[PDB]
């Protein structure tokens, strides 16, 4: 009846994102950015619910202040850990 003494489960771990390319380096989000790869690389989120690598969106904002999928203004809303 009771028949529950022990349980061992297996769970996949993934970022909380809808679709995965980072759309700057075109890598896969879980992989390393185009900079950390030619050798910490967390994920940054946008107030419009867009997600990018951190080192990618950093350089992009260094040059131009537009979220590069929706030609709008950009500011950080949720970092990633």
């Amino acid at each position: 009846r009771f028949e529950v003494k022990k349980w061992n489960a297996v769970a996949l771990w993934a970022w909380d994102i809808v679709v995965d390319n980072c759309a700057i380096c075109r890598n896969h989000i879980m992989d390393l950015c185009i900079e950390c790869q030619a050798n910490e690389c967390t994920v940054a989120w946008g107030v419009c619910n867009h997600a990018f690598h951190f080192h990618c969106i950093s350089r992009w904002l260094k040059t131009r202040q537009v979220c590069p999928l929706d030609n709008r203004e950009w500011e950080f809303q949720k970092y990633g850990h």
Partner: protein, 260 residues
């Protein structure tokens, strides 16, 4: 000089190989051009600006028969031209280039400033640079081969020079695909989805240069354990990146994302 007809079930601008040793784009006729479409290749090769001038003449003194599409120069005065090809016996008007049946029958009478120059300069510069390098690949192959022999006789085995050969091959492929990508990046109106592309390709360009550098000088000697690791790590990166570039272009074609 080859004499072989390449029969196919369907014309689709895909590449074919002749068995004489050549591979061409069955539709247009040039060498295989993977990211860029045929029409832009033609428009860029006309004014290619550093390989041929007879195209200037052809554009300046010839028209094209609408039916058979061969260049025709006129040295008569009738305007009632008749195409003297093998099986294109069509007749038309030399000026309007339309059919002659009504034309002149009863009453139907026929009668780059500053910025573009700089852009074209930059793009044509890169394109010609890569053309020069792709023309010298024979020298590159022979160079690395002789160097393989030399490094081998000085107490180095055969497997090392094997990895070196593979690296060279990947390098040549990456240049041959940066070529046509520059062409494609000419006819492209600047929007967000174009800065992304023109920013990835610069990085791949730089990596290509670094690898083509590693080879020539740092072949020197007796540093195998590190130089070999560097070169392997550096050509896997280049190959992956160029596949990313091609996939980006084709996805853009699918989703109608570019603007010219």
């Amino acid at each position: 000089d080859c004499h072989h007809v390449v029969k196919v079930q369907y014309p689709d601008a895909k590449p074919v190989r002749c068995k004489c040793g050549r591979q061409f784009c069955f539709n247009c006729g040039e060498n295989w051009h993977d990211p860029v479409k045929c029409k832009w290749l033609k428009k860029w090769i006309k004014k290619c600006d550093d390989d041929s001038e007879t195209s200037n003449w052809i554009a300046a003194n010839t028209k094209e028969c609408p039916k058979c599409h061969v260049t025709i120069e006129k040295d008569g005065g009738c305007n009632h031209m008749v195409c003297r090809n093998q099986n294109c016996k069509a007749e038309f008007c030399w000026v309007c280039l339309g059919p002659w049946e009504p034309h002149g029958s009863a009453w139907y009478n026929c009668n780059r400033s500053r910025a573009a120059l700089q852009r074209y300069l930059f793009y044509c510069n890169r394109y010609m640079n890569h053309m020069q390098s792709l023309r010298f690949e024979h020298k590159l192959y022979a160079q690395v081969k002789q160097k393989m022999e030399e490094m081998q006789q000085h107490n180095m085995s055969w497997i090392e020079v094997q990895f070196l050969k593979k690296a060279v091959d990947v390098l040549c492929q990456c240049r041959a695909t940066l070529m046509y990508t520059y062409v494609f990046a000419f006819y492209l109106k600047k929007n967000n989805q174009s800065i992304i592309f023109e920013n990835n390709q610069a990085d791949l360009e730089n990596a290509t240069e670094v690898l083509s550098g590693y080879l020539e000088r740092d072949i020197s000697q007796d540093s195998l354990q590190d130089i070999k690791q560097k070169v392997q790590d550096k050509y896997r990166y280049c190959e992956s990146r160029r596949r990313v570039l091609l996939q980006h272009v084709h996805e853009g074609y699918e989703k109608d994302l570019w603007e010219y």
